[PDB]
């Protein structure tokens with residue numbers, strides 16, 4: 241048996257209550273037959289790689305404990321069989337990484353605004369309420385949906401060289417750096433450290449190069465440019481805390497501003513492929 245809490249109700253569910261619609265550790269898009277909800281179902285194989293499995297179990301542990309955060313992807317329930325665990329997860333439309341790829345470039349600042357609000361809050365929530373750092377903030381872990389919701393995913397290592405903070409590469413808030421890097425990536429359409437062929441080469445550029453700020457010739461708001469400059473403060477002791485960042489003007493504006501993220505998302509998903 242499994243118990244799913246989904247759409248406000250509690251169900252006893254059998255693995256047969258899930259209709260597999262295909263693949264997307266191992267993830268299936270599945271329809272729940274008792275309701276018509278379409279969900280993401282992760283499989284943990286008893287016979288799988290033990291490192292993957294413990295990563296999965298860590299993500300699961302954070303996610304279960306984050307039921308009260310609406311900026312973190314929700315788990316509806318689990319099914320344990322003799323050989324497998326199936327994990328029912330909130331299905332999103334796509335990630336920020338896939339949106340960059342489809343768009344062939346810049347996501348508009350107003351969307352990066354809403355995204356920034358949501359991700360900083362998810363991050364803040366798990367620092368405050370659970371003492372958890374994410375350790376792998378990047379665009380593939382930032383998810384969006386048709387309802388204009390933006391959420392954080394994947395806490396299995398609660399980490400990609402590309403988005404590593406300077407103090408993580410060389411130690412005397414590293415998550416805030418990685419956020420900064422993602423935003424520059426997504427606002428300009430280009431991952432800021434160019435033509436790196438290996439992980440260590442990106443690490444080298446992080447440390448030797450100037451922070452990769454938003455380009456002045458793109459007419460980004462000063463708000464946004466300053467938010468990034470604060471996040472991309474290489475000296476971590478000088479880089480701001482979530483509670484400081486929550487009052488940054490960039491966050492405060494897009495928090496109170498009305499942005500139709502859903503129509504933008506629906507329209508961009510329509511007008512593109514892959």
Ligand SMILES: C=CC(=O)Nc1cccc(-c2n[nH]c3cc(C)ccc23)c1
Nearest residue numbers: 280329330331332333334335337338380
């Ligand atoms: C950019 C890579 C990617 O993960 N894409 C993507 C595209 C569409 C939906 C999901 C997704 N929705 N819900 C999830 C829950 C987990 C644990 C992982 C991925 C998803 C993920």
